[PDB]
mmCIF file of N, CA and C in Angstrom:
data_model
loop_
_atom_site.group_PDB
_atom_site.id
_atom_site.type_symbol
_atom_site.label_atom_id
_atom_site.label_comp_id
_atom_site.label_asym_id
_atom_site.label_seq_id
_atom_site.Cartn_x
_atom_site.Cartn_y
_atom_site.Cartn_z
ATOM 1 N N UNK R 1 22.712 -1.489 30.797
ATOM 2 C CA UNK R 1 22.550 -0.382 31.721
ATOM 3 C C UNK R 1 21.062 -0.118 32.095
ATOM 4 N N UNK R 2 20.115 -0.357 31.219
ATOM 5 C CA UNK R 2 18.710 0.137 31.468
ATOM 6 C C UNK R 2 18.171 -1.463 32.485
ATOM 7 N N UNK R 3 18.657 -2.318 32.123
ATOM 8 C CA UNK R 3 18.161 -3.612 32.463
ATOM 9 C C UNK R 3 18.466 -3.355 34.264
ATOM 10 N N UNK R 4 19.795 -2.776 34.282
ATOM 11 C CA UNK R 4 20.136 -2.036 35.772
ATOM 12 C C UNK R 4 19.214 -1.473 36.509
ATOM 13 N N UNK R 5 18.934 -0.288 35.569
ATOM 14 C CA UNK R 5 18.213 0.807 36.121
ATOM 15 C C UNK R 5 16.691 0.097 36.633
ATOM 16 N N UNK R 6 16.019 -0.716 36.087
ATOM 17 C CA UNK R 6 14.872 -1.658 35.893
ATOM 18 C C UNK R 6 15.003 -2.137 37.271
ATOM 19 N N UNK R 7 16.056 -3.109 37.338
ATOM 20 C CA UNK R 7 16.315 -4.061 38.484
ATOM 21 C C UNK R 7 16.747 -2.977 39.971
ATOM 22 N N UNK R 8 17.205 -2.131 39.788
ATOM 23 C CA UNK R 8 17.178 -0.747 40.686
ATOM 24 C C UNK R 8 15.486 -0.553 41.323
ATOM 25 N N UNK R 9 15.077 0.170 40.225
ATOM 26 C CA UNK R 9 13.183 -0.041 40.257
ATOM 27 C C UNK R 9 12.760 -0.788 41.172
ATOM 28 N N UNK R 10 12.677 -2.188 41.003
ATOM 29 C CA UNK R 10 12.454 -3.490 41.348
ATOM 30 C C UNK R 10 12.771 -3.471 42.772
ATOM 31 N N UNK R 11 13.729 -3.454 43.032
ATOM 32 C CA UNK R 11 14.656 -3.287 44.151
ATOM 33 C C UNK R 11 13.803 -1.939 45.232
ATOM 34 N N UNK R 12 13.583 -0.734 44.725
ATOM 35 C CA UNK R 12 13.222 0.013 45.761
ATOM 36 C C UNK R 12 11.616 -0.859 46.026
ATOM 37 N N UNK R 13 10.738 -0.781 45.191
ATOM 38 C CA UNK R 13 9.664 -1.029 45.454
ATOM 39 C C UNK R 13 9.673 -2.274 46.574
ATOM 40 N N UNK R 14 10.296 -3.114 46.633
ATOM 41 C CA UNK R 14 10.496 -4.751 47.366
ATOM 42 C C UNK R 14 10.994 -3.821 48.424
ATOM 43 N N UNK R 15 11.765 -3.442 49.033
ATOM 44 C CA UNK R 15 12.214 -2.385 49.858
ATOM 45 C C UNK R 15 11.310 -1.532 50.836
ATOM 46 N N UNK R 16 10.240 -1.215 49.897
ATOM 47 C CA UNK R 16 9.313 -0.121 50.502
ATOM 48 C C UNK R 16 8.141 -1.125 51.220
ATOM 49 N N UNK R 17 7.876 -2.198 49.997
ATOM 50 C CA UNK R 17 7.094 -3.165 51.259
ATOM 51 C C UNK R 17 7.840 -3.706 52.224
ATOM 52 N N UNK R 18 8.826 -4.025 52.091
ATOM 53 C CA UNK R 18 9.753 -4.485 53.645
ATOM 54 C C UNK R 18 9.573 -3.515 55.079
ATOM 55 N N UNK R 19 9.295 -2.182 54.505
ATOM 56 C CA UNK R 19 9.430 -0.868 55.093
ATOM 57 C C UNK R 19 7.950 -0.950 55.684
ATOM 58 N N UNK R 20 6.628 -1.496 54.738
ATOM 59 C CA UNK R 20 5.535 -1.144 54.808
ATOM 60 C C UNK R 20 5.306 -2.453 56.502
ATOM 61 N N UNK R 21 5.443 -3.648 56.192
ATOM 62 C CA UNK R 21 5.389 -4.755 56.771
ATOM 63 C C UNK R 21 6.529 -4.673 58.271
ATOM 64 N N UNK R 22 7.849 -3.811 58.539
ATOM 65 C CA UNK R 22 8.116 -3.879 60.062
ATOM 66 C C UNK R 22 7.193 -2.691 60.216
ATOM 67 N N UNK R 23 6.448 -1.964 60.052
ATOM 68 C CA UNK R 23 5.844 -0.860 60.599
ATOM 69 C C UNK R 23 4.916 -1.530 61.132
ATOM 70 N N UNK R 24 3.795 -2.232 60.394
ATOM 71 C CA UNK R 24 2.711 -2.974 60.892
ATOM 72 C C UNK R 24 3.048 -3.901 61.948
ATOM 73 N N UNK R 25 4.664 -4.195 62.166
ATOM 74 C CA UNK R 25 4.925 -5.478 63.084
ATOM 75 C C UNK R 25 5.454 -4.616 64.563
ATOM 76 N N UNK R 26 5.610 -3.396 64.093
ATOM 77 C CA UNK R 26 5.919 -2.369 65.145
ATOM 78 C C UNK R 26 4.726 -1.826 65.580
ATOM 79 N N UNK R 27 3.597 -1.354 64.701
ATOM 80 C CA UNK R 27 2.305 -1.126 65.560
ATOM 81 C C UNK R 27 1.718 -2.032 66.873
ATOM 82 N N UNK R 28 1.820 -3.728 65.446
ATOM 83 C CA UNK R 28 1.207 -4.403 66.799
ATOM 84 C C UNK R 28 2.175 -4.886 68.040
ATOM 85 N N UNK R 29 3.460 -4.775 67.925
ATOM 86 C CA UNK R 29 3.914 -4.520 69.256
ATOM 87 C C UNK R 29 3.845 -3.805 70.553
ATOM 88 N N UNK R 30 3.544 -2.886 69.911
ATOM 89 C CA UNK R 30 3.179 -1.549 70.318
ATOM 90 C C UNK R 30 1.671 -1.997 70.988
ATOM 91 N N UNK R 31 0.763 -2.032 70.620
ATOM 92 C CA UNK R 31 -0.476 -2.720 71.186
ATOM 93 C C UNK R 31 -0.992 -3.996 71.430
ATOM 94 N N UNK W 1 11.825 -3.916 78.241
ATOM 95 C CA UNK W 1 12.377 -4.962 77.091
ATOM 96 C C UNK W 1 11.905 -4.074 75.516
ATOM 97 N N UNK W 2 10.583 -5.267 75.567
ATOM 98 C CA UNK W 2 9.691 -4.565 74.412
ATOM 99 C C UNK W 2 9.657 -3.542 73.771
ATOM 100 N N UNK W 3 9.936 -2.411 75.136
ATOM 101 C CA UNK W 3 10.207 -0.795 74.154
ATOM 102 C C UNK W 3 11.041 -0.597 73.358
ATOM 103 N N UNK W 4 12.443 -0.834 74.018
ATOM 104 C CA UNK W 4 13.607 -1.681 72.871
ATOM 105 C C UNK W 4 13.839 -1.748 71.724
ATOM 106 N N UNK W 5 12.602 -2.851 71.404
ATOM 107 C CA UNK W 5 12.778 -3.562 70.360
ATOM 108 C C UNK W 5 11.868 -2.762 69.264
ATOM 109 N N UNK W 6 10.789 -2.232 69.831
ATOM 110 C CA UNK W 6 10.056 -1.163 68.952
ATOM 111 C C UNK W 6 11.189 -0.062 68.942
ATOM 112 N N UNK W 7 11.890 0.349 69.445
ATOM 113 C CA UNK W 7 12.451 1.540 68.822
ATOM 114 C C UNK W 7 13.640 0.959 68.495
ATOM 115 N N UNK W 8 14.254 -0.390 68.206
ATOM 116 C CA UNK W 8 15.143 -0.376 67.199
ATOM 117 C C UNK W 8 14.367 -0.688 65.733
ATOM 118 N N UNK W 9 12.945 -1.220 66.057
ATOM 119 C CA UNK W 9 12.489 -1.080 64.941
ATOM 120 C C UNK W 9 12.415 0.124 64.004
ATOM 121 N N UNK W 10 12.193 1.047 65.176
ATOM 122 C CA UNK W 10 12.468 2.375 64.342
ATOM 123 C C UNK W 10 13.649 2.974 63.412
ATOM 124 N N UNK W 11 14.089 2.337 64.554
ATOM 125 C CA UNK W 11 16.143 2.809 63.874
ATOM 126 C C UNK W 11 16.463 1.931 62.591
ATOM 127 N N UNK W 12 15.625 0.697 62.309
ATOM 128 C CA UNK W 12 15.827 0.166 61.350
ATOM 129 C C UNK W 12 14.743 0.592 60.142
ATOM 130 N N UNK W 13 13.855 0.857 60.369
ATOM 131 C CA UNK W 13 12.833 1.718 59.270
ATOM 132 C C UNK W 13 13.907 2.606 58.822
ATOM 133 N N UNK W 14 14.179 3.408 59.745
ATOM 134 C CA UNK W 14 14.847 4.770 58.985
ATOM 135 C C UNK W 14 16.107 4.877 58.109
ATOM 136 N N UNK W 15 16.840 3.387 58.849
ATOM 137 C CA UNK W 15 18.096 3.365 58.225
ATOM 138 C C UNK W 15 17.354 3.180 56.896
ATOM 139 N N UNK W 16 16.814 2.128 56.468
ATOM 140 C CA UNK W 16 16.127 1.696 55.188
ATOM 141 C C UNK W 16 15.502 2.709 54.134
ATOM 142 N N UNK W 17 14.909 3.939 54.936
ATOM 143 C CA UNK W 17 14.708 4.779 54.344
ATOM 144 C C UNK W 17 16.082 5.671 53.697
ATOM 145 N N UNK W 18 17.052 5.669 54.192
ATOM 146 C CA UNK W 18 17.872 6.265 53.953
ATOM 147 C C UNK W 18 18.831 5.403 52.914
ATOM 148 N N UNK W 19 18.840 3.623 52.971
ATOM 149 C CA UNK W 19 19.091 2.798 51.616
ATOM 150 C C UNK W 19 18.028 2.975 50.507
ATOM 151 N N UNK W 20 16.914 3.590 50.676
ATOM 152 C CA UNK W 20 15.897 3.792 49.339
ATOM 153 C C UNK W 20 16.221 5.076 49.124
ATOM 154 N N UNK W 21 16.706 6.134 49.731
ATOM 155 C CA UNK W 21 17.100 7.137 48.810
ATOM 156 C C UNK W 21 18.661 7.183 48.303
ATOM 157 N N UNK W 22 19.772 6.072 48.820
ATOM 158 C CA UNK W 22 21.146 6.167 48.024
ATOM 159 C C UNK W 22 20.687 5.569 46.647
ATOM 160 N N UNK W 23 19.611 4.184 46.939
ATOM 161 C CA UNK W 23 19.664 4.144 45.629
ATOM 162 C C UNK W 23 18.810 4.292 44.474
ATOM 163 N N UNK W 24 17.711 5.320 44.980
ATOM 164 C CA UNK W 24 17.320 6.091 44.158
ATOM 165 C C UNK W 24 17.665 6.803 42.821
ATOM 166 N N UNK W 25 18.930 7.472 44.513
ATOM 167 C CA UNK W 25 20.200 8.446 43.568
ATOM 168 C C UNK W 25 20.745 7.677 42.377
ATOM 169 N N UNK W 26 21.323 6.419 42.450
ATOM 170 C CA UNK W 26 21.560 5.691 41.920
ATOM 171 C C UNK W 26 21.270 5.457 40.650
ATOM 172 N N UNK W 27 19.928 4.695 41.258
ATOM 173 C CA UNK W 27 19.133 4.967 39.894
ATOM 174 C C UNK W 27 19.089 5.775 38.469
ATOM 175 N N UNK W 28 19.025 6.985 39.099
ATOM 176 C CA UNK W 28 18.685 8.248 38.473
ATOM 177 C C UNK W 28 20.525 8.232 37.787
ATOM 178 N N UNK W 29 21.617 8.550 38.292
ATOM 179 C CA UNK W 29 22.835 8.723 37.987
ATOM 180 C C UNK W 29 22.876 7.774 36.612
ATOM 181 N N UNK W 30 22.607 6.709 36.508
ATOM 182 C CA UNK W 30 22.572 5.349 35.689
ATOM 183 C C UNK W 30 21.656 5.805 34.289
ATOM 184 N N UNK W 31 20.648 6.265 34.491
ATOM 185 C CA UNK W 31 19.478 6.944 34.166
ATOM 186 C C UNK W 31 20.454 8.059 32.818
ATOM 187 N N UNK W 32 21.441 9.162 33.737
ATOM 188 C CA UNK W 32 21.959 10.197 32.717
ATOM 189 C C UNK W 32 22.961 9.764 31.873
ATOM 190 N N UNK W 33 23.364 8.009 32.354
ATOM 191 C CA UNK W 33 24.895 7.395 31.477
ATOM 192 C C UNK W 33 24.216 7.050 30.116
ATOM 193 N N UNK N 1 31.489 6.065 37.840
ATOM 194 C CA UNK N 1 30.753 4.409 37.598
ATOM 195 C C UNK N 1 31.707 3.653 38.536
ATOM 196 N N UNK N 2 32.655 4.224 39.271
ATOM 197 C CA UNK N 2 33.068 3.521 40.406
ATOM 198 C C UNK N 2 32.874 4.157 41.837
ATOM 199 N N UNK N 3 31.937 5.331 41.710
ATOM 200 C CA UNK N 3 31.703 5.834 43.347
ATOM 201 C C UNK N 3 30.405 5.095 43.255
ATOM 202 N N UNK N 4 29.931 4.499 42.251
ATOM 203 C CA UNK N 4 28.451 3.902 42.347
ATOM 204 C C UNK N 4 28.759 2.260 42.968
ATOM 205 N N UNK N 5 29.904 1.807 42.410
ATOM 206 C CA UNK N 5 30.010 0.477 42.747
ATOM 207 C C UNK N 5 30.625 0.401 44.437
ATOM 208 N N UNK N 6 30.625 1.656 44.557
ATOM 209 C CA UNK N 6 32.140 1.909 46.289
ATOM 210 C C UNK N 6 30.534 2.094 47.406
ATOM 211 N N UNK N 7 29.527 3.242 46.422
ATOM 212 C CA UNK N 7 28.277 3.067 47.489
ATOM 213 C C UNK N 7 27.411 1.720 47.275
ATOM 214 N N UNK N 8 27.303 1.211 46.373
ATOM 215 C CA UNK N 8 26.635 0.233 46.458
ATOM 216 C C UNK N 8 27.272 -1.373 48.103
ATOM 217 N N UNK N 9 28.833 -1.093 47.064
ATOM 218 C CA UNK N 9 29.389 -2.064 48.773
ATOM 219 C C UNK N 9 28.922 -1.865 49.669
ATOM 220 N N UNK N 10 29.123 -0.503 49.889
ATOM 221 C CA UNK N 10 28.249 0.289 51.120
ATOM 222 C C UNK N 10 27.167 -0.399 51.814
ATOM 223 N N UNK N 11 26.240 -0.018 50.478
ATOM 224 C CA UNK N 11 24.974 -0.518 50.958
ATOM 225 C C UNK N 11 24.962 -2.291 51.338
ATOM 226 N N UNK N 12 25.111 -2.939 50.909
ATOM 227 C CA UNK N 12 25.393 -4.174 50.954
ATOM 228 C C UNK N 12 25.719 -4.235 52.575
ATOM 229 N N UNK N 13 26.582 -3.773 53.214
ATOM 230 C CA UNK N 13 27.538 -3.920 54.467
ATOM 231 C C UNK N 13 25.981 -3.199 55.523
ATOM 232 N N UNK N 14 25.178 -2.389 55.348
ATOM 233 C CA UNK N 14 24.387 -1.636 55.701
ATOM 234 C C UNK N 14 23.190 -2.023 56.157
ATOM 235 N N UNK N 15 22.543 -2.888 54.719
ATOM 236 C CA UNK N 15 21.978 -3.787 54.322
ATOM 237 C C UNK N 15 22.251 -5.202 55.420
ATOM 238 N N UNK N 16 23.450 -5.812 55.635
ATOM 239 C CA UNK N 16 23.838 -6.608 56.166
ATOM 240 C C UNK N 16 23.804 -6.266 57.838
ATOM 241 N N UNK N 17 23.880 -5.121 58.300
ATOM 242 C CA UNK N 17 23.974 -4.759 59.713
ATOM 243 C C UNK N 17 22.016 -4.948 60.276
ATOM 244 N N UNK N 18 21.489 -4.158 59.178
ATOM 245 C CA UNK N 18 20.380 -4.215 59.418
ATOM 246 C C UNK N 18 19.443 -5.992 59.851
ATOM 247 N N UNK N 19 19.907 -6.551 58.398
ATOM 248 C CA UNK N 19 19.683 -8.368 58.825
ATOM 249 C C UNK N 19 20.420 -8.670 60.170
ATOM 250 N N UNK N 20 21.324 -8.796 60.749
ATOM 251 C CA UNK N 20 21.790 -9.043 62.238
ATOM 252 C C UNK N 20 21.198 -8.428 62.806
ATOM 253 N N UNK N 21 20.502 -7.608 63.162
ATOM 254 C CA UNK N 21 19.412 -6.213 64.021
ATOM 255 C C UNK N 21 18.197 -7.176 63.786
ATOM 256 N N UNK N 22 17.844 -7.243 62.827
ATOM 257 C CA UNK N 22 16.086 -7.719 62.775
ATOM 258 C C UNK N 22 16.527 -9.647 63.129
ATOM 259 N N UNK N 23 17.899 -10.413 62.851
ATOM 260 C CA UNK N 23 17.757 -11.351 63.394
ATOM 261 C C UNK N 23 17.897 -11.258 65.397
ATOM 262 N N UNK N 24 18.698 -10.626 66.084
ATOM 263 C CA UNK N 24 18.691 -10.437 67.204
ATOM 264 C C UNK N 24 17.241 -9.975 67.915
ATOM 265 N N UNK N 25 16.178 -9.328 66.915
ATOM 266 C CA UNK N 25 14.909 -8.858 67.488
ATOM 267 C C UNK N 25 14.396 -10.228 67.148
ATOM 268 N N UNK N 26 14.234 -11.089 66.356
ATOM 269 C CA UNK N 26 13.298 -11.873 66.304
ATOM 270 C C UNK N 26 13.801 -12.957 67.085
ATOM 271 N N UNK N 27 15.032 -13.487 67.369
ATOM 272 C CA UNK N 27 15.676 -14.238 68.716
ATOM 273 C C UNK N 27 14.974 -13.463 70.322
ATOM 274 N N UNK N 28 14.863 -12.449 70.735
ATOM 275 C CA UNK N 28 14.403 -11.858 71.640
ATOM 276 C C UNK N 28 13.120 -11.986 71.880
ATOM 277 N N UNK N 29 12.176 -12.069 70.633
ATOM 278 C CA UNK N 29 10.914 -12.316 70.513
ATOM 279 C C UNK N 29 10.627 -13.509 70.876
ATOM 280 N N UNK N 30 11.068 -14.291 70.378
ATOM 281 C CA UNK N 30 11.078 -15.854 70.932
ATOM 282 C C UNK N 30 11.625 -16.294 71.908
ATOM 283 N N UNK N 31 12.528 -15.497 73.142
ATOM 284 C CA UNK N 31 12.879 -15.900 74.176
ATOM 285 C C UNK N 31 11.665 -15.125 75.408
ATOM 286 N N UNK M 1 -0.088 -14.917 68.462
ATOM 287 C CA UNK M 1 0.265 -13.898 67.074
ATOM 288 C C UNK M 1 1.766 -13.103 67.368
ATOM 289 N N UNK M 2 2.158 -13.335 68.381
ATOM 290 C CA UNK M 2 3.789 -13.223 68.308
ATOM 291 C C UNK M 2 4.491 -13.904 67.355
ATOM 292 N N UNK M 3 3.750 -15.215 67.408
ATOM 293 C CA UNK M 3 4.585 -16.043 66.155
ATOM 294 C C UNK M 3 4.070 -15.542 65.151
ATOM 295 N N UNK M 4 2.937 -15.193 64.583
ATOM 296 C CA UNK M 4 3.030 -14.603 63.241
ATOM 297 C C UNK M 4 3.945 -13.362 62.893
ATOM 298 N N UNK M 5 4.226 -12.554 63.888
ATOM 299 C CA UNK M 5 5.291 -11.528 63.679
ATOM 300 C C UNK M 5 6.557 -12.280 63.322
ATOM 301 N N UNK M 6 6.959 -13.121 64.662
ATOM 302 C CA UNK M 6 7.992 -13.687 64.448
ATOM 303 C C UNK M 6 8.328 -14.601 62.830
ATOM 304 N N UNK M 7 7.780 -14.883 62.483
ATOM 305 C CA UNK M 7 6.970 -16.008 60.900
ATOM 306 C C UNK M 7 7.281 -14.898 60.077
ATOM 307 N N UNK M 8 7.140 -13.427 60.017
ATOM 308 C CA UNK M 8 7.157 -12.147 59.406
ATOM 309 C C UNK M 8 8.537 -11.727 59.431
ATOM 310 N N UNK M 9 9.092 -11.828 60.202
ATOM 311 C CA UNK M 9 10.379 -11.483 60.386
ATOM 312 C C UNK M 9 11.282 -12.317 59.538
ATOM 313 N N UNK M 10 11.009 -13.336 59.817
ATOM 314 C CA UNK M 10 12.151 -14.735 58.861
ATOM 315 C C UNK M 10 11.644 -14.351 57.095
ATOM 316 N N UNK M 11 10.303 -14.385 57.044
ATOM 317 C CA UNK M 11 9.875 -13.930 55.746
ATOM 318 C C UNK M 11 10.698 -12.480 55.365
ATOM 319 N N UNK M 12 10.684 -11.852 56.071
ATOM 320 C CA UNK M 12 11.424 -10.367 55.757
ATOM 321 C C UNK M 12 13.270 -10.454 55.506
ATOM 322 N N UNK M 13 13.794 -11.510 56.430
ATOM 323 C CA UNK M 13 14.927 -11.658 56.539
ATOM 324 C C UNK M 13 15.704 -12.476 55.212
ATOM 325 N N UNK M 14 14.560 -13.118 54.734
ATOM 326 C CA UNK M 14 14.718 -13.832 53.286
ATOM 327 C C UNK M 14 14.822 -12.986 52.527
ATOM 328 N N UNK M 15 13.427 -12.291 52.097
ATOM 329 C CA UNK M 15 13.668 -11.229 51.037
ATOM 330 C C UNK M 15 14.831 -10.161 50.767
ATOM 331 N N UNK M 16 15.084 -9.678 52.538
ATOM 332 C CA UNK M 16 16.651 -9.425 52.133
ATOM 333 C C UNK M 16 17.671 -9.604 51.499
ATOM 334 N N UNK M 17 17.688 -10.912 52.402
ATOM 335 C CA UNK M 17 19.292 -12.045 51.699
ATOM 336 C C UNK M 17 18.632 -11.323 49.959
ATOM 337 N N UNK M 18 17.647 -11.688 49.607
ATOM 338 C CA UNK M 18 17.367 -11.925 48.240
ATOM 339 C C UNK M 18 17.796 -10.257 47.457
ATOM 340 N N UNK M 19 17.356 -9.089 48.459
ATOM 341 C CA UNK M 19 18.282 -7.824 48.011
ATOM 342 C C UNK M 19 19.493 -7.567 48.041
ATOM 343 N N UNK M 20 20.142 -8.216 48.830
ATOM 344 C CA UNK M 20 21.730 -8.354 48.898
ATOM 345 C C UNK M 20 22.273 -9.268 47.561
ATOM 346 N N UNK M 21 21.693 -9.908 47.301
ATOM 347 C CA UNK M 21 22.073 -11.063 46.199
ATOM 348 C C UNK M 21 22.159 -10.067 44.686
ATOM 349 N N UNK M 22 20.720 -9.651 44.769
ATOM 350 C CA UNK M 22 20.887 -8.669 43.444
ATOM 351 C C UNK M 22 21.532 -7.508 43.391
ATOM 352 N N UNK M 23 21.730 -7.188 44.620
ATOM 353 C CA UNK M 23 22.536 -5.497 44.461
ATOM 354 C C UNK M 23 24.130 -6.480 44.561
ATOM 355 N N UNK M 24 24.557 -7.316 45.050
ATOM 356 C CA UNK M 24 25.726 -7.712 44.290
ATOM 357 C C UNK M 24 26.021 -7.779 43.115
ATOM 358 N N UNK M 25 25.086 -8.461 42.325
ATOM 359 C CA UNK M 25 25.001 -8.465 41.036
ATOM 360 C C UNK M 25 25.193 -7.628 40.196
ATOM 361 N N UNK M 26 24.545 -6.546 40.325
ATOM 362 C CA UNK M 26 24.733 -5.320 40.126
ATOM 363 C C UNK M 26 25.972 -4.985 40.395
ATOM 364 N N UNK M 27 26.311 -4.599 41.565
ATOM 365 C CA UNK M 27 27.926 -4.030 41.935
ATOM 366 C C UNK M 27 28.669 -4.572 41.410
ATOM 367 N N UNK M 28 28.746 -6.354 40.588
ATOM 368 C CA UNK M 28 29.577 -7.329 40.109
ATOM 369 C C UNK M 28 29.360 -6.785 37.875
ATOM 370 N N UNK M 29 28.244 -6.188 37.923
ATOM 371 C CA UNK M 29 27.977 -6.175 36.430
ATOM 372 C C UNK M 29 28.562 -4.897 36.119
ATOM 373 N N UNK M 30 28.880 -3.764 37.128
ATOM 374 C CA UNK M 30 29.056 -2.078 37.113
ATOM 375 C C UNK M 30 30.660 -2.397 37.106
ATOM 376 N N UNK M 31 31.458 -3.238 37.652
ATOM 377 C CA UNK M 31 32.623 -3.388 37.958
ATOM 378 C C UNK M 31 33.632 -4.174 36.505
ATOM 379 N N UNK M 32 32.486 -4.561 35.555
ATOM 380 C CA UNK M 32 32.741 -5.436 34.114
ATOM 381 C C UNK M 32 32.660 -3.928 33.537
ATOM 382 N N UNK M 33 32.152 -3.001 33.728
ATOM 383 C CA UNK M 33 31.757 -2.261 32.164
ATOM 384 C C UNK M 33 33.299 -1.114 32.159
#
């Protein structure tokens, strides 16, 4: 269950750079 | 065109934001078992 | 421990709409 | 530098697949207990 919760963790952070990286691909569209 | 595609970019940021907080919740629920 | 596994499908299917969205933008990009 | 977006996108579209893979896993290990 904790090994879950870990791989959960894991999971948002990889997520948030996915999040971080179309923004930057949406700026430079944008300009 | 282009505008488009930047604002489905948007629509897809946000959805994503809204998969990082189900499984947040998640998380946390797992967290009190 | 089964509304977690019913949202997780969820997400998965969600998850999956989103990949067809960012593949149709990056086909567009290249046309 | 379109193609580097575009190059960004396939890179992004991988890492996905690769979140879908583990949150199965998950949904497949929650469904054993």
């Amino acid at each position: 269950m904790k090994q879950i919760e870990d791989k959960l963790e894991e999971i948002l952070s990889k997520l948030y750079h996915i999040c971080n990286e179309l923004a930057r691909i949406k700026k430079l569209l944008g300009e």
